[model samples]
Each structure stands twice: as C-alpha cells, then as structure tokens.
Target chain A: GRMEISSLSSIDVFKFNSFSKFSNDKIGVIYDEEKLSKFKVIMNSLDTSEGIKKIEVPKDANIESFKYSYHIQPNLKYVEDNNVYDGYFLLYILVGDSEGKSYIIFSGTELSYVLDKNNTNILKEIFLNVK
Target chain B: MEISSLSSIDVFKFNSFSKFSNDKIGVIYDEEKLSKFKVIMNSLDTSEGIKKIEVPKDANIESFKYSYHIQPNLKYVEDNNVYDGYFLLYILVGDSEGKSYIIFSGTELSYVLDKNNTNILKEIFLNVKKQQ
Candidate 1:
C-alpha cells in the first residue's frame, strides 16, 4: 500500500537524531509561513560539506510519491564501533492547503548530503511542485 | 539470454514455514517439464499476474538475466487465492560459476508472497553484476 505523508508522525524523530552527528544536526519539518500563504511544507537538513538540503512540497504536491528514503553511511564512529550506523535528522514540515488540510513532509535521511542546493531550481521542480 | 532457455524455474510461496520449510513450493518452469511451465504461465496470464517478461539486451546467454513483474489483482483474493502486491522477479545466471539464482523484490506484494510461500522472509540481497 502507498504510505501517506501523515505517517511521519508515527516515527520517533528524537531517536533518529541520536544515531548520527551531522555538521548541522538540526532537522525538522517547517511550513512556509512567509510565502504561498503558509501552503508549503519542507524537510531540511545540513551537511559539513553541503549547505542546507531540502525536500520541499508545495500545496499541490503528490502525497503518494513522497516516500522516506533511509540509508546507512559506511563509516562513522558509532556505526564502526557498534556496527549499527543507520541514522536520520529530526525536522518536520507541515504543509496546509487553502482547504485547511495539513500534510507533514519529512526525510528519512540527511537531505544536505542528498540534494545539491545550488540546483534549487531543478530540485524545486522535481520535489516542490514549483513551476 | 531469452527466457525460453531457462532450464528450470520455481515459484515458491514466501514466508510461511521455517527457515528451511521447503522454499520450492511450485515448479513453474523446467526444461524436462515444459508442461508445468506452460501451466503456470497460462494461469498467471489469465489472472493478470504476469506483467512483462524480457531479457536484458546486453547480457550473455550463459550469464544473463530474465526479469518479470507480477500484477496484484483483486480477483485472485476474491477467489481465496494468494494475491500479493505487485512483485518483480529477477533470475540471474552466473557465467564463471555456471550457477543461477532468483531474486524477488516488491512493496507490499513481496510481503504477501513471502508469507504465503515460504517460512522466512527472503529479500533480493545480492547485486548480480557482469564481469568486465
């Protein structure tokens, strides 16, 4: 079955954060309170080398295609020591449409390492539903 | 390699028995038993289970891959059949080893197939790559 964006609530974000120490360990879901009349949702993360990485969803984004991609970096202090290196950041983005329905958007991995923010235009079009 | 050359093919129910609970439940294809292969293929086609069958264009005959997907139809469930989610089946033949193996992967369909077909959940673990 297709997973819903709302399922992000069932995940334990705090436990996920404890797994890895990122350049910017802060992770969370945020809404576009300034633009689009608070109709956009975003999942943001940071990397030591890469700046901020984001998975943004506009009001009209397809909820079904939004899946949490999880992974484990091959080498890390905790992972190499304990042999368990799977980790994630803690950030949530809540998006609401004019209809007053809210959908949560978040990533299963550090977005900064995955997305190249320099190509925001391309990234936004593929993930944010921005034309 | 074309699928027609498969010496034998088996389709077992996933995750139902123990670790060794007879994973080979059904023989879908066999060189010496073409009749069984035809029967399973026909049944799958009628039920819309077989989606597409193709051999990789750049693969070798002794070390090629045959891939196919299964459709999840509600009709199978209504008839009390084991209808798992849409699944992808991959069969890989080894060149140097002269061996072959099958791997199955899917979303919910894989879970259903595993539970109904075998004793343990089996995933497509290895990456079969061609030697340069």
Candidate 2:
C-alpha cells in the first residue's frame, strides 16, 4: 500500500515556470525517503518562507533524491496532452544557473524529459531573478 | 475556496489486452485556484458517475478551463509490484470497441508508462480477470 503522489501543485507549477525562465538552472531529485521527508517539511513551510533556505542542494547529489517532495503536486497542464496521468516533479538547487545537481522528483510517468541545456540555463536565471 | 462533492465510485483492474485500453488521461491544473474550489465542492456532493474526463492532447489551454471534476478512485498494480496511489480518473471519449465513453477506474501508480506495452499488463489483466 505505498502511495506516491503525482501531479504538480500551484506553487510547484509557478516554480516550474520560474525555472523555465532561467537558462542554467538545474532540477534535482531526492530519492532517499528520509531526505524527502525533510524536503516536504521545507516545501510546506515555503508559504511562510520559513524553512526554504535550509534546503541544501549537494554538489554530487543523486538525481533521484529530488522526486519525492515534488510528487505531492506534479500535475502540469501540458501533461494532459501527452496522455500522461501522473508524473514526478523535477527539483533543482540553484547553482550558478546551468551547473548544479539533478534529481528525479517522481518516477511514475514514463513521458518525462530533462530540460534541454538552453531551458536549463533559462530556468536557473529565472529562479534567481524571482529570489 | 471552491469545493466539490462525491456521489458514486467505481474500481477497475487490468482485465483487458493493454493498460492503455483502460483509458489515456492526464491532470488539468487550475491556475485560478479553480481546482482548489473543485476539491471543496467534490467533498460535498454525492453521485454514482465519474467526476472528470480525459483531457484532450495537443491543447495548451489553461488548466482551469477543464471540468476538473472526475472523482473516481484512480489506481494501478503490476503483478508483484505494489505501488498503488491516488489519482484522477480517466474516461475515454472516443470510439474503439464501445461507442460510449467507458469508465476506466483504478488506483494510479508512480510509474508512468503504457501498461499494454509491457508484459506486466498481461499479468495484471489475468490476475484481475478472475475478479471481474
């Protein structure tokens, strides 16, 4: 009875767009259950800007670690067109735009793709601007 | 805070040739918090039919434009794998075997792939056929 949430939340979608606007931003996924738990705490606390700064995007982090906190709300509007019902969120820690770590937020939807190098940088720049 | 209600429910399994045979679908996110209000409404109503329909592919229309009402229990299981989770129901609105849209229901899993494309779909279909 393992339940994994797929689909993006409102905040998550906005975040995605924020990254999309940047060029060198990288999305990371946290696979370890324990780390994921901590991320959830951080994300939930984002409403009050409490625990977000505490999140650490390791330099050599595993790409899979970023998928958990993202699954809670992974639904993106474009997903419907691809016949994809669910997906994992791609989380990235800002590291000089295009040169950070990557994680697999969700592992469900098979129709996932990493942002191209251009998009990656664009996402990073946008996220930094928002901050 | 817009809230929706639930009326009836249906549960489905892989009792067919392919998992895709069940229904192809995706989630429709509401930018205007339309879905947030929808969840609230779904909590109050009660019925026996599906809550939402499959979204059309190739349309980048706003997420809030869709009905966002399908409340069916969406789930899936592949043989020994046990990654069952909650998801939105998918009802196909095309003519394949049956003319009318079929209510394809199940619990969704974290893996996104064509079940029918994999051998796993056959195993699950056989396993669930006994129950059908």
Candidate 3:
C-alpha cells in the first residue's frame, strides 16, 4: 500500500522525531543543523520509520561519504494476509566532497513490495538537491 | 523445501544456462530461456523444496505486483563457513486487461536458490504497478 503522503504533515521535525522514537540507541550519521532540518522535511513527507531496529553507523565515519538511512518494518496486516513478512531498508548517501554539491546513492531491500522506481525516484529527487 | 499449487497460473521461470556467477546477483527476461529455467527448477532435489501454487479463482490479477527482497536469516552453516542462503525469489505477471499474478521462492538469506541450493540467483522480476 499506498497511503496519502499528506498524513505526514501532522508531525513536526519529522526525521529527528522519528529517529528519536525508533532509533532506541542505534547509531546514526551526524548532520549539521541546516542539513538535518532539510533532511527532516524530506524524510517526513515519505513517512519514513526506523523499522524494528536501528542500524548503527560508526561515529568516526567520514562525513563527506556518510549516508543517511531508514527502513520500513513489515506491517502486521501484510504478514497476516499474505502469510509472508514484508518491508524495506534504504540508504541515502551524499557523494562528493563539497556540502552543496552531491548526488545520492540508494540501496535497500523491499519486502512489502511497495518500493518501486517511481516512488524511489521521488525520494532521490528530494535528497538530490539538498544544500 | 516446499511447493504449493493455487487456482490460476502464470509461470515465469529462470535461465539456467545463462552464465550465473556465485558471488553476484543476476536477472534475465527471455521467454525462450525461461522455459529451460522452469525445467531446471522443477528438477531440484530437496525434501521441502519448490512448490507451485495456483491462483485463486476469485483473485484479482490487476492487484498483483512484484517485490525484489532480501532478509537476514542469520543461520550458521558449518559446512561452507557461511550462513545458509536466506534470499528470496518473487514473480508477478499482469495483462493489459488489468489482471496480474505473483509468486515467490527462496530462503532466509533472501537469495533465490536454484539447483545448487546456493545464494547465486539475485535477479528478480521487477515489473510492478505504479503507486497511486
């Protein structure tokens, strides 16, 4: 399923809030205040979640090559109805040395079957122009 | 190893002779090649292996879609110095009349294990419906 992306409007400071809620002690990449704010807006619109567990990104990792990531845990309804679990994990990496100049590298598994190229492209577009 | 037969059928098999490697994942879409692919898959020997399920009579094919996925089974296989392959194999078929069907086969590592029962097959059917 497709749900209205509009529902995400209810949350303020979406990415950080989601990270705070689902991260549950998982390590994530560090971002500057400006980058975090911009990333939050885009992540919120997509209704991103931390899934069942958080992935730990090392603290000493390179910022220039650091990647932002998230996962959609399997929905209870989907598991019950299909007799199979479904979900996806995605990473958005910022490539290039300059902050204002970078492209995104995305990779993940989609069990829920909801992630398609069209939707993924939309996600890519949002992060591609990040400042 | 497991197999299930459902109500209707739209089978898409894999190409066995197409130079598949052990470490990398691969995909293909040639009907001629798939025919042979089906034969090879059906010949696999595992107690609880492949099963074919027929689609339900009242099912809606238009609602069918394909999902390419992988998961962590994390089981230790002492023989190969690797965990058991936990890959997944998924297929979906749809028509212009808005009818479609989907199928799945794989293990916990989420790889599609063919005859050798290894995580060599990484290619999958990616044709899916657009999100509304």
Candidate 4:
C-alpha cells in the first residue's frame, strides 16, 4: 500500500541513444573499454531478450554488497520515458574491477527510488527519476 | 532529451545465457511457459522472493490469478511445511475459493489482492526474518 516510483521510471537508457526525456534529465556515461572519462555521448545500448525473463545476479552481487540489485519485475517494462518500445526491462552494468567500483542495475515500471542521488546533470549516460 | 517510457533503456537480451547467481527461494507453478511471472526464488532472493511470490490458489483461480506450480524451488526449511510446500513465513489460505484465479506475475509483492483476503494468517502470510 505504499507504491509511487514512476516519473517514467528513471531516464537515459542512452537518451535518444544519448539525449532527451527530462530535457537532459540526469544523463549518463559510466561505460568502459574507453579510457574512462567517457559519455559526453557515445552510445552503448544493452539488449538481451529471448523474450525476456531471467535476469538473476543478486545474491548480493559482487563488490561491496549492494543492497541486492533492486528486484523489480512487476512484469517487465524496466525503463521507458519517451520513444515507445516499452515492457520488458532489466539493466545490469559494470565490472570485474570490483575494488575500483562499477555497478549499476536498474529495474523499473513504477519508478520512485533516489534516496540519495544527485549528480545534477550527471555522467556515463545513466540518469534516473522518481524521488 | 530523448524519451521512451520515461526511463527505459535495456531491452532484455543478455544472451550467452544472460545473468548468473541465485538458487531456490520459492513460487512459480501452473506448468511451464514463461516470458513473465517469475518467482521460483533466487533472482537474488529479495527476501523469500517476496515470500513465495504468490502461492495462493483455490477452487479454480477466478481471475484472481495464483500460482507456484511446484518443482525444485521450495526450500525455507524451518518447520518444513508440506505439499507444494509452505509453513510459517508463508502458509496462507484465504479467499475461501482458493480456486478463483488464473494468470500471474509479481504485482509488487502483492497480498491477497482480490476475492476475500480475509485476515490472511497473522496478517499477510505472517512473516519472520532471516532465511533467504
């Protein structure tokens, strides 16, 4: 009885591949393989679906023990703000560099989760909403 | 600003077998066939996968939709429960019809959604703590 995270469930799936839903809303670029200062806008959209259903990677997923990858799956639709292609979500990002730190997995459909997020215009191209 | 459902990016396709990790927690019945309704425990075990996802079906599953088909996914031990399985932590029996539902998937850790949720154990499948 306490649901409310849906300002379109966070933005920047690559923003138009690299820009525009919240009018630049929280951008991203935390990608790798690059020298590591990236994302002024270099695209990399990850898609994995055999129809979509098997994302599991959280028994306290790597590194520091993340609060367990936000188990969202109220029936797919992970993240969408504009374009169209909705339903069927799951974004899991980052590394083997554990010590250096790089983890980002977002599951959406009803948004609402930014208890302490704020990079303002942000980077690596990962933007979110519903606070 | 680019837009498409407010914040959707990943389109589900991790091939090479996609993700990895997690083993048993509970729920997912009505025989195979899934592109949705996943909760047989271990997708990271978000607390008994929200405590048995939704294992409450009766009479015939009205549209109230309930499932947990049964296979190797049930293991919360404790008192051990039985049948398709479930005791303490989840061991509910509501809406009399118990058979008034059909079709399903995580509806936000739902609880006795429709029909007669009645009291629902000590109040919503009555919970405990650890064990995930």
DockQ winner among the candidates? 2
lDDT of 2 by residue, B95-119 (tens): 2221212222343211212222122
By TM-score, who's the top model here? 2
Candidate 3 overall lDDT versus native? 0.28
| Per-residue lDDT of candidate 1, residues A26-96 (tens digit) | 23332232321111112211221122333344334443333321111111111122122233334332222
Q: DockQ scores for all the models shown?
A: 0.01, 0.04, 0.02, 0.02
Chain B TM, every candidate:
0.22, 0.21, 0.22, 0.17
Kindly report the docking quality category of candidate 1.
incorrect
Candidate 4, residue B67: the lDDT equals 18
Tens digits of per-residue lDDT, candidate 3, B55-108, equal 333433233333222221212213222232332333333333333222334322
User: Candidate 4, residues A30-114: lDDT per residue as tens digits?
Assistant: 2231212122111111121111223343444443342222222112122222112234234333322323333334533222212
Winner of 3 and 4 under lDDT: 3
The recovered share of true contacts, given per candidate in order, is: 0.00, 0.00, 0.00, 0.00
What TM value does the first chain of each candidate achieve? 0.19, 0.26, 0.24, 0.22
The segments of candidate 2 whose C-alpha lies over 4 angstroms from its true place after superposition are A1-101, A104-128, B1-9, B12-71, B74-90, B93-132
lDDT values, one for every candidate? 0.26, 0.27, 0.28, 0.24
Query: Which of candidates 1 and 4 reaches a greater lDDT?
Result: 1
Error (Å) of candidate 4 at residue B2 is 33
What does the i-RMS of model 4 come to?
18.4
TM agreement with the true structure for every prediction: 0.20, 0.21, 0.20, 0.19
Give the higher-DockQ candidate: 2 or 4. Answer: 2
